[PDB]
Design an enzyme around this catalytic site. Structure first.
Site, PDB file in Angstrom:
ATOM      1  N   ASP A   7       0.878  -1.159   0.000  1.00  0.00           N
ATOM      2  CA  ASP A   7       0.000   0.000   0.000  1.00  0.00           C
ATOM      3  C   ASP A   7       0.921   1.216   0.000  1.00  0.00           C
ATOM      4  O   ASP A   7       2.084   1.116   0.387  1.00  0.00           O
ATOM      5  CB  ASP A   7      -0.862  -0.045   1.266  1.00  0.00           C
ATOM      6  CG  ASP A   7      -1.797   1.135   1.399  1.00  0.00           C
ATOM      7  OD1 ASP A   7      -2.340   1.634   0.390  1.00  0.00           O
ATOM      8  OD2 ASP A   7      -2.055   1.617   2.507  1.00  0.00           O
ATOM      9  N   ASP A   9       0.168   5.262   0.614  1.00  0.00           N
ATOM     10  CA  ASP A   9      -0.018   6.221   1.710  1.00  0.00           C
ATOM     11  C   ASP A   9      -0.045   5.505   3.048  1.00  0.00           C
ATOM     12  O   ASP A   9      -0.661   4.450   3.179  1.00  0.00           O
ATOM     13  CB  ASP A   9      -1.300   7.029   1.512  1.00  0.00           C
ATOM     14  CG  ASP A   9      -1.297   8.303   2.303  1.00  0.00           C
ATOM     15  OD1 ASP A   9      -1.065   9.375   1.701  1.00  0.00           O
ATOM     16  OD2 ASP A   9      -1.482   8.333   3.533  1.00  0.00           O
ATOM     17  N   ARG A  16      -0.230  11.277   3.943  1.00  0.00           N
ATOM     18  CA  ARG A  16      -0.255  12.507   3.129  1.00  0.00           C
ATOM     19  C   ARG A  16       1.083  13.268   3.139  1.00  0.00           C
ATOM     20  O   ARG A  16       1.142  14.451   3.494  1.00  0.00           O
ATOM     21  CB  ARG A  16      -1.416  13.442   3.510  1.00  0.00           C
ATOM     22  CG  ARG A  16      -2.808  12.865   3.265  1.00  0.00           C
ATOM     23  CD  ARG A  16      -3.509  12.335   4.519  1.00  0.00           C
ATOM     24  NE  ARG A  16      -4.957  12.205   4.322  1.00  0.00           N
ATOM     25  CZ  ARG A  16      -5.830  13.222   4.324  1.00  0.00           C
ATOM     26  NH1 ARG A  16      -5.421  14.478   4.508  1.00  0.00           N
ATOM     27  NH2 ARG A  16      -7.126  12.984   4.137  1.00  0.00           N
ATOM     28  N   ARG A 119     -16.183   7.733 -12.259  1.00  0.00           N
ATOM     29  CA  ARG A 119     -14.731   7.701 -12.268  1.00  0.00           C
ATOM     30  C   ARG A 119     -14.298   6.464 -13.014  1.00  0.00           C
ATOM     31  O   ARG A 119     -15.108   5.631 -13.356  1.00  0.00           O
ATOM     32  CB  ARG A 119     -14.177   7.778 -10.820  1.00  0.00           C
ATOM     33  CG  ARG A 119     -14.897   8.873 -10.039  1.00  0.00           C
ATOM     34  CD  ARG A 119     -14.123   9.633  -8.980  1.00  0.00           C
ATOM     35  NE  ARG A 119     -13.888   8.849  -7.801  1.00  0.00           N
ATOM     36  CZ  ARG A 119     -14.036   9.235  -6.518  1.00  0.00           C
ATOM     37  NH1 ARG A 119     -14.504  10.421  -6.139  1.00  0.00           N
ATOM     38  NH2 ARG A 119     -13.725   8.362  -5.585  1.00  0.00           N
ATOM     39  N   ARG A 130     -20.828  16.705  -3.652  1.00  0.00           N
ATOM     40  CA  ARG A 130     -19.496  17.133  -3.240  1.00  0.00           C
ATOM     41  C   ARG A 130     -19.152  18.593  -3.413  1.00  0.00           C
ATOM     42  O   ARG A 130     -18.138  19.033  -2.875  1.00  0.00           O
ATOM     43  CB  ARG A 130     -18.348  16.239  -3.742  1.00  0.00           C
ATOM     44  CG  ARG A 130     -18.474  15.470  -4.995  1.00  0.00           C
ATOM     45  CD  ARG A 130     -17.674  14.147  -4.976  1.00  0.00           C
ATOM     46  NE  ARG A 130     -16.382  14.282  -4.322  1.00  0.00           N
ATOM     47  CZ  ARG A 130     -15.935  13.526  -3.316  1.00  0.00           C
ATOM     48  NH1 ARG A 130     -16.629  12.507  -2.848  1.00  0.00           N
ATOM     49  NH2 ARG A 130     -14.747  13.769  -2.808  1.00  0.00           N
ATOM     50  N   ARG A 137     -20.220  19.572   5.096  1.00  0.00           N
ATOM     51  CA  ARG A 137     -19.833  18.168   5.208  1.00  0.00           C
ATOM     52  C   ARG A 137     -19.979  17.727   6.661  1.00  0.00           C
ATOM     53  O   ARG A 137     -20.459  16.635   6.903  1.00  0.00           O
ATOM     54  CB  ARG A 137     -18.382  17.938   4.782  1.00  0.00           C
ATOM     55  CG  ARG A 137     -18.079  18.206   3.322  1.00  0.00           C
ATOM     56  CD  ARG A 137     -16.734  17.653   2.876  1.00  0.00           C
ATOM     57  NE  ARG A 137     -16.607  17.754   1.435  1.00  0.00           N
ATOM     58  CZ  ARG A 137     -15.764  17.064   0.665  1.00  0.00           C
ATOM     59  NH1 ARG A 137     -14.910  16.197   1.181  1.00  0.00           N
ATOM     60  NH2 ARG A 137     -15.792  17.255  -0.659  1.00  0.00           N
ATOM     61  N   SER A 175     -20.149  10.683   1.186  1.00  0.00           N
ATOM     62  CA  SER A 175     -20.282   9.813   0.017  1.00  0.00           C
ATOM     63  C   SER A 175     -20.073   8.316   0.271  1.00  0.00           C
ATOM     64  O   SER A 175     -19.648   7.890   1.339  1.00  0.00           O
ATOM     65  CB  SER A 175     -19.333  10.269  -1.097  1.00  0.00           C
ATOM     66  OG  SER A 175     -18.022   9.778  -0.889  1.00  0.00           O
ATOM     67  N   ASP A 204      -1.500  -0.516   6.151  1.00  0.00           N
ATOM     68  CA  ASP A 204      -1.716   0.124   7.432  1.00  0.00           C
ATOM     69  C   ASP A 204      -3.191   0.264   7.775  1.00  0.00           C
ATOM     70  O   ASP A 204      -3.526   0.846   8.783  1.00  0.00           O
ATOM     71  CB  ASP A 204      -1.116   1.513   7.374  1.00  0.00           C
ATOM     72  CG  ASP A 204      -1.809   2.360   6.368  1.00  0.00           C
ATOM     73  OD1 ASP A 204      -2.389   3.378   6.736  1.00  0.00           O
ATOM     74  OD2 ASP A 204      -1.878   2.032   5.176  1.00  0.00           O
ATOM     75  N   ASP A 218      -6.386 -12.103   2.375  1.00  0.00           N
ATOM     76  CA  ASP A 218      -6.334 -13.060   1.270  1.00  0.00           C
ATOM     77  C   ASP A 218      -5.252 -14.102   1.563  1.00  0.00           C
ATOM     78  O   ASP A 218      -4.134 -13.756   1.953  1.00  0.00           O
ATOM     79  CB  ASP A 218      -6.054 -12.333  -0.038  1.00  0.00           C
ATOM     80  CG  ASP A 218      -6.094 -13.242  -1.255  1.00  0.00           C
ATOM     81  OD1 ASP A 218      -7.055 -13.149  -2.032  1.00  0.00           O
ATOM     82  OD2 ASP A 218      -5.200 -14.047  -1.552  1.00  0.00           O
ATOM     83  N   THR A 221      -1.388 -14.218   0.399  1.00  0.00           N
ATOM     84  CA  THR A 221      -0.628 -13.067   0.814  1.00  0.00           C
ATOM     85  C   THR A 221      -0.101 -13.315   2.240  1.00  0.00           C
ATOM     86  O   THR A 221      -0.831 -13.824   3.096  1.00  0.00           O
ATOM     87  CB  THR A 221      -1.603 -11.859   0.711  1.00  0.00           C
ATOM     88  OG1 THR A 221      -1.407 -11.127  -0.544  1.00  0.00           O
ATOM     89  CG2 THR A 221      -1.461 -10.864   1.819  1.00  0.00           C
TER      90      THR A 221
HETATM   91 MG    MG Z   1      -3.007   3.374   3.473  1.00  0.00          MG
END
Ligand code: MG
Ligand code: CL
Ligand code: MG
Lengths: 242, 242
Positions: A7, A9, A16, A119, A130, A137, A175, A204, A218, A221
């Site tokens: 993964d 981020d 971020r 998308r 949005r 929000r 959303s 994470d 899974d 993995t």
């Molecule tokens: Mg992450």
């Protein structure tokens, strides 16, 4: 023949922020020790390139963007799929029409704009839309916890279109995401499955409802739940210390 | 006490490029000759700052973004209005609900996402939705010319909400804009009207249906239709040669 899948981020980076030199250095060492490396993340290729740097395709043997809907191996694209191809036009316009009717018929205090976003890998659906402000929000999120507006819509779409075989995921505040079943991170596994004896996965957000959950759980993995990229480094150092 | 007001794109710049040093130099000269300068454009302040440079607020005496919904004088903000304040929440959600029903009930071949966008100064409404591809925009535009889908929707909204006092404008290929009557470029005139004997306006889109039309035609304004910023310079040089 082992591969290490991460993964992005929070797993390879501060949550971020771009990947650290520490993290970069620890991956280099894993690769020269003979591991293949891959990256899989819900976000698009541009976003992964932002966080991981511009030499992303040279630094990783596999890159799986949008969970592998856009997939690179050895710096070269080998797979590109999208929601429109999976579903087809007729099914897309039927789903979206039903979303729009449902949202139009809501009796909620505030609505703005951008209620159904189409998308590449999913519909993103928002009862308030949005194009609301952050204060809006916050308000909606609180309204939602009391009235379960998003859960009710999901129930309605699941009952209307069972044959579409869609999974549904509640988002932050305003959303939910709608995508074909299987279009979570496990989507990438079909592309490494037959080339590696051992597939480590690092993530994470590995508890139920986190976007690392299905790939971690899974059976193909070896899952590693990290709290931070500094734990990722520690696990890797330990894998390499042997 | 004269002021020179300019549309931005195409009037002070090459169409979709930053303002030239030639243009910059000719404005400098107009200001030292004692003209006040202002800029008015449909696009937001960030966009105007992109085209005109970062010293925009120092280079112009007045800056009117989104036609003056965000307005600066002598480098300092003096007006900020928005669609939500003009209309109020109840009217906004009523309009948008009706848009969503209307669009849901369309019998058109292709729909995608982002059908109603709520912006600071307008609704932008798209039967196909703005999350379509360019080839899809081309197709829809052709479909629209034959079936007049966008014009029919406008008729429907005008008849439903006459009391909302909204103007309607057909966009490029896939959309139309909906805004309070008067929220074109003439909106800025109330802010200079009582401070200048002569108000020149320069614009390149001054024919009926162009977004410079109302401000050009307005009797408070000495309108100058330009084909390019190089004509703007020529007019200015001539104003200054005297
Ligand atoms: Mg992450
Ligand atoms: Cl929408
Ligand atoms: Mg123009």
């Amino acid at each position: 023949k082992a591969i290490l899948l991460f993964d992005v981020d929070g797993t390879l980076t501060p949550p971020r922020n771009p990947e650290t030199h520490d993290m970069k250095e620890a991956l280099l060492k894993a690769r020269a020790a003979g591991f293949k490396l891959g990256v899989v993340g819900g976000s698009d290729f541009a976003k992964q390139k932002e966080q991981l740097g511009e030499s992303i395709l040279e630094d990783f043997d596999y890159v799986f963007s949008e969970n592998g809907l856009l997939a690179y191996k050895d710096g070269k694209e080998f797979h590109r799929n999208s929601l429109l191809r999976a579903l087809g036009n007729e099914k897309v316009v039927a789903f979206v029409k039903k979303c729009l009717h449902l949202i139009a018929d809501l009796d909620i205090p505030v609505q703005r704009g951008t209620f159904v976003e189409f998308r590449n890998g999913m519909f993103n659906v928002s009862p308030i839309g949005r194009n609301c402000s952050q204060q809006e929000r916050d308000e909606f999120e609180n309204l939602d916890k009391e009235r379960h507006i998003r859960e009710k819509l999901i129930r309605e779409l699941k009952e209307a279109f069972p044959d579409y075989q869609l999974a549904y995921s509640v988002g932050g505040q305003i959303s939910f995401d709608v995508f074909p079943k299987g279009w979570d991170k496990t989507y990438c596994l079909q592309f490494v499955e037959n080339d590696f004896e051992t597939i480590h996965f690092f993530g994470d957000k590995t508890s139920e409802g986190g976007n690392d959950y299905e790939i971690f759980t899974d059976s193909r993995t070896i899952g590693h739940s990290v709290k931070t990229y500094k734990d990722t480094i520690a696990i890797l150092e330990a894998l390499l210390e042997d």
